[PDB]
Amino acid sequence: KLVQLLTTT
Amino acid sequence: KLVQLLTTT
Amino acid sequence: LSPEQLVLTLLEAEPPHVLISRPSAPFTEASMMMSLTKLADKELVHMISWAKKIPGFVELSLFDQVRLLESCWMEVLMMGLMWRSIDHPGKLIFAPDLVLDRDEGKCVEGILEIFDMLLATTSRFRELKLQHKEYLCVKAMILLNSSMDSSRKLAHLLNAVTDALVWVIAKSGISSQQQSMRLANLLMLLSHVRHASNKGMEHLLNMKCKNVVPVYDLLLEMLNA
Amino acid sequence: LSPEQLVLTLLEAEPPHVLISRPSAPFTEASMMMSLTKLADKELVHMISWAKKIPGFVELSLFDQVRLLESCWMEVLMMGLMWRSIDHPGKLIFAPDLVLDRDEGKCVEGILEIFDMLLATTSRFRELKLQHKEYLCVKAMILLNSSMDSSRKLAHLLNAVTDALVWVIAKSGISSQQQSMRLANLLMLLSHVRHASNKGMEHLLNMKCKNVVPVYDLLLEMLNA
Numbered sequence: 001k002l003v004q005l006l007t008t009t
Numbered sequence: 010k011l012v013q014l015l016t017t018t
Numbered sequence: 019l020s021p022e023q024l025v026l027t028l029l030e031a032e033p034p035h036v037l038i039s040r041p042s043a044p045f046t047e048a049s050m051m052m053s054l055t056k057l058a059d060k061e062l063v064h065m066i067s068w069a070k071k072i073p074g075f076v077e078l079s080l081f082d083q084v085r086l087l088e089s090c091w092m093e094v095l096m097m098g099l100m101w102r103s104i105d106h107p108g109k110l111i112f113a114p115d116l117v118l119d120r121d122e123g124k125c126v127e128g129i130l131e132i133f134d135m136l137l138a139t140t141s142r143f144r145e146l147k148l149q150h151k152e153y154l155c156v157k158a159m160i161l162l163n164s165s166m167d168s169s170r171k172l173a174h175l176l177n178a179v180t181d182a183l184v185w186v187i188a189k190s191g192i193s194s195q196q197q198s199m200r201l202a203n204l205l206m207l208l209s210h211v212r213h214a215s216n217k218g219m220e221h222l223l224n225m226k227c228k229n230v231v232p233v234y235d236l237l238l239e240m241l242n243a
Numbered sequence: 244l245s246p247e248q249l250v251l252t253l254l255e256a257e258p259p260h261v262l263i264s265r266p267s268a269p270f271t272e273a274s275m276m277m278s279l280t281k282l283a284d285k286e287l288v289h290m291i292s293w294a295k296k297i298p299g300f301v302e303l304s305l306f307d308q309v310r311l312l313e314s315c316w317m318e319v320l321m322m323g324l325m326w327r328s329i330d331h332p333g334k335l336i337f338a339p340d341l342v343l344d345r346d347e348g349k350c351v352e353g354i355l356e357i358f359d360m361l362l363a364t365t366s367r368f369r370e371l372k373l374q375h376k377e378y379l380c381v382k383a384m385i386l387l388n389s390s391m392d393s394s395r396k397l398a399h400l401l402n403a404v405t406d407a408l409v410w411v412i413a414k415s416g417i418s419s420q421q422q423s424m425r426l427a428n429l430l431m432l433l434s435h436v437r438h439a440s441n442k443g444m445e446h447l448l449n450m451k452c453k454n455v456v457p458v459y460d461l462l463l464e465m466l467n468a
């Protein structure tokens with residue numbers, strides 16, 4: 001999730 | 010302990 | 019990237035205000051933790067966007083970007099909070115419609131402590147009359163200094179912002195000697211923000227283990243790190 | 244009282260080098276924790292005397308003197324540890340007869356993490372080439388800023404030590420811009436010393452609750468508060 005926002009958003 | 014060392018030298 | 023361009027970049031990166039409604043009835047222990055945990059979660063999402071706009075942040079390794087956010091998310095939240103409550107002594111502006119009074123922090127088991135040191139640090143900031151531009155740098159510095167080759171890059175990024183804070187302060191006009199004094203007085207406050215964060219996250223952790231409110235996804239991931 | 248004279252008095256407030264009377268020998272888990280707690284306890288006694296030698300400290304209300312010490316003692320302890328370790332990279336000079344390596348800090352669970360924090364912040368001060376006179380001001384500041392009518396005296400006192408640290412930096416003869424940058428990098432590290440502090444207490448307090456660490460009166464009192 002944290003990683004998601006960082007790399008996916 | 011703290012207070013006596015604070016009030017004495 | 020000149021100090022002014024860095025400050026102007028941070029100003030533009032200022033996340034928008036997360037709107038949340040204060041419960042209709044007077045707070046209960048749950049309703050409040052409910053409102054604070056929800057607010058935090060939403061602000062966290064906006065915080066990640068804000069971070070990726072901090073000159074050179076995205077250049078760091080992902081694992082670094084992660085460690086930084088994991089270790090400072092509460093400080094950045096509270097630094098933003100304090101700033102919002104700046105022109106409202108005794109009052110804590112968690113949001114435009116969610117204004118909390120020092121006394122309301124009694125419906126929560128042991129949060130009043132937190133609310134007090136938050137108001138205190140705020141009063142210090144108000145006393146020192148913290149400026150918007152200074153605030154943007156102090157907040158950005160909190161993130162970069164939470165280091166609690168890529169690392170070397172980190173040092174350079176943090177210096178860039180420090181140069182920016184110095185640049186802003188100089189523009190106040192006060193004597194050089196006084197610029198050092200204000201710069202110093204502002205930074206000494208970072209420890210207080212740091213403390214509140216620790217007793218703020220410890221408190222949050224307890225609540226969860228207490229089941230006093232649901233804490234999941236982003237809010238949870240950040241809690242454990 | 245000029246900044247130079249204030250830094251002098253701090254040098255004069257410097258506590259003596261403390262040893263734990265432990266003959267050279269490999270460290271175990273129980274042998275290491277007792278040494279660290281026996282050392283901290285001795286240093287604690289010397290720390291009370293130290294602060295009392297800080298101009299105006301005794302002038303404060305007894306309540307303040309206590310609160311200030313009950314909250315910063317661990318930080319002041321680690322700050323001292325870092326200055327003594329500054330020249331022995333990879334080692335933590337707790338005391339002449341108590342030097343520890345990062346690997347030796349593995350015997351005790353969690354300690355390794357703390358050791359890293361201490362070693363990191365230390366090597367960090369090392370790169371900045373921390374000067375003794377700077378160390379004196381910083382440590383004094385840690386005391387006077389651990390605060391979360393009498394207050395004026397404190398602020399006025401904290402202010403003086405800050406003014407003293409600025410002086411020290413100005414005497415190094417470096418650039419003005421660099422004088423601000425150095426002052427900044429130094430104050431930012433307090434956040435790190437404060438972080439390894441909260442963790443240090445957490446670990447110690449956990450050890451206390453388990454009666455695995457010998458009973459030390461001054462140490463216990465300071466921990467409970």
Ligand SMILES: Oc1ccc(-c2ccc3c(Cl)c(O)ccc3c2)cc1
Pocket residue numbers: 051054055057058061095096098099112129132217218219221222223225
């Ligand atoms: O912008 C913001 C939004 C929320 C907070 C905040 C501060 C302290 C908190 C504590 Cl003690 C809790 O137990 C649970 C949630 C909390 C949330 C701080 C700044």
Ligand SMILES: Oc1ccc(-c2ccc3c(Cl)c(O)ccc3c2)cc1
Pocket residue numbers: 276279280282283286320321323324337354357442443444446447448450
């Ligand atoms: O000058 C000094 C002397 C001792 C310490 C120190 C640091 C970490 C400690 C930890 Cl983690 C413990 O569990 C128990 C005792 C400790 C004592 C720090 C500075």
